[model samples]
Target: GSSGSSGHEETECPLRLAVCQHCDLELSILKLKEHEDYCGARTELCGNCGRNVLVKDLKTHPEVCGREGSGPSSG
Candidate 1:
């Protein structure tokens, strides 16, 4: 006396979602680790903004990170 009308089965999908430890970007587990290696925003901590910023942009970001006009000349 069992019903066979429903043919769907509930199954849990494998965990593939991952968050970047440095920048918190939601990404696929497969590429998350690889992406983190070169992710500029997740590379280093910015002294001015106190946030992780790309090494290349770190030099110019502080100019706008509430440290405008505050440079070697100012000090």
Candidate 2:
């Protein structure tokens, strides 16, 4: 079968311009899903201080938890 039309239009996914909610990084739908799993800014509880910290920064905060000058001390 042959058609007289010789041009084909291409369609793009609407989700291709999606952004990451955590870091505000622009990414495709597939990349956003993957980035969410390991985003450093993702909210998570700190085991050492019991305060919320970004997943990416959690590792270093514990090494100085509760130590003087680690953070601003309250009077």
Candidate 3:
């Protein structure tokens, strides 16, 4: 129903905030992807343990259990 009333709003403020896992910050998901892409590019070393893991793990640095996994096309 359409009501011509003052201070009336249509589903105002619907979207909830999302967080960027890389930087662990709160932001709108709409722009999060753009920010996430670049933010994730910034890499760092893991705590106390001496292993190289990206803020994203897909940067080709795979420091896992007792094996060096190289990137190859075959399964």
Which candidate has the top score in TM-score? Answer: 3
Model 1 lDDT on a 0 to 1 scale: 0.67
Please, what's the RMSD in Å of model 1? Answer: 9.4
Tens digit of per-residue lDDT, candidate 3, span 40-63: 777676443445456776344544
Candidate 3 collision pairs: none
| Span of 10 residues, lowest total lDDT, candidate 1 | 66-75
Across 1-75, the per-residue lDDT of candidate 1 in tens digits comes to: 868787788899768698876567798988987887787544575555465557556667777766554344321
Q: For each candidate in the order shown, give its overall lDDT on alpha carbons.
A: 0.67, 0.67, 0.64
RMSD of each: 9.4, 11.8, 11.6
For candidate 2, lDDT tens digit of each residue in 1-74?
A: 87889768889865547787667788777777788787865767655556666766656767766662455433
Off by over 4 Å in 3: 1-15, 47-53, 58-75
Estimated TM-score for each candidate? 0.37, 0.38, 0.41
True lDDT of residue 53, candidate 3? 56
